Amino acid sequence: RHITQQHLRRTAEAEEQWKLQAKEIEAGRKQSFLSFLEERGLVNSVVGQRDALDKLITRKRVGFYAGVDPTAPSLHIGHMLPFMILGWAYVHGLKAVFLIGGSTAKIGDPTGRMDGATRRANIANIHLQLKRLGFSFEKYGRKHGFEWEWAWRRALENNNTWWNKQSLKEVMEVLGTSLRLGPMLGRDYVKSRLASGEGMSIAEFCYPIMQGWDFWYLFQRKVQVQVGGSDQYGNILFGMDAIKGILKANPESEWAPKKDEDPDLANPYGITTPLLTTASGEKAVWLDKDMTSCYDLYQYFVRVADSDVERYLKMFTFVPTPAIKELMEEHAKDPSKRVAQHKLAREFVELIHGSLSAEQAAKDH
Ligand X SMILES: N[C@@H](Cc1ccc(O)cc1)C(=O)O
Q: Does 74 bind ligand X (CB under 6 A)?
A: no
**Out of 125, 211, 273, 317, the residue judged to bind ligand X by CB under 6 A:** 211
Q: Does 166 bind its own copies (CB under 8 A)?
A: yes
For residues 83 and 296, give the distance between their C-alpha atoms in angstroms, rounded to a whole number: 22
End-to-end CA separation in angstroms for the chain: 57
Q: Which does 168 bind (CB under 5 to 8 A by kind): its own copies, ligand X, none?
A: its own copies
52, burial (CB in 10 Å: exposed 0-12, middle 13-18, buried 19+)? middle
Q: Are 103 and 72 in contact (CB under 8 A)?
A: no
Q: Which does 146 bind (CB under 5 to 8 A by kind): its own copies, ligand X, none?
A: none
Q: Does 54 bind ligand X (CB under 6 A)?
A: no
> For residues 244 and 289, which CB has a smaller minimum distance to its own copies in the complex?
244
- Neighbouring residues of 359: CB distance < 8 A, sequence distance ≥ 6: 346, 350
What residues between 186 and 245 interact with its own copies by CB under 8 A? 190, 194, 199-206, 209-210
For residues 139 and 268, give the distance between their C-alpha atoms in angstroms, rounded to a whole number: 30
Q: Rounded to the nearest whole angstrom, what is the least distance from the CB of residue 193 to its own copies in the complex?
A: 8
Q: Which does 68 bind (CB under 5 to 8 A by kind): ligand X, its own copies, none?
A: ligand X
Which DSSP state fits 76? B
Q: Rounded to the nearest whole angstrom, what is the least distance from the CB of residue 308 to its own copies in the complex?
A: 41
Q: At CA 209, angle to CA 51 and CA 76, rounded to 5?
A: 75
What residues between 152 and 171 interact with ligand X by CB under 6 A? 159
Q: Which does 297 bind (CB under 5 to 8 A by kind): its own copies, ligand X, none?
A: none
Query: Residue 285: left if φ>0, alpha if ψ -120 to 50, beta else—which one?
Result: beta
What residues between 332 and 351 interact with its own copies by CB under 8 A? none
Note the residues at the interface with ligand X (CB under 6 A): 67-69, 99, 101, 104, 109, 159, 211, 214, 232, 235
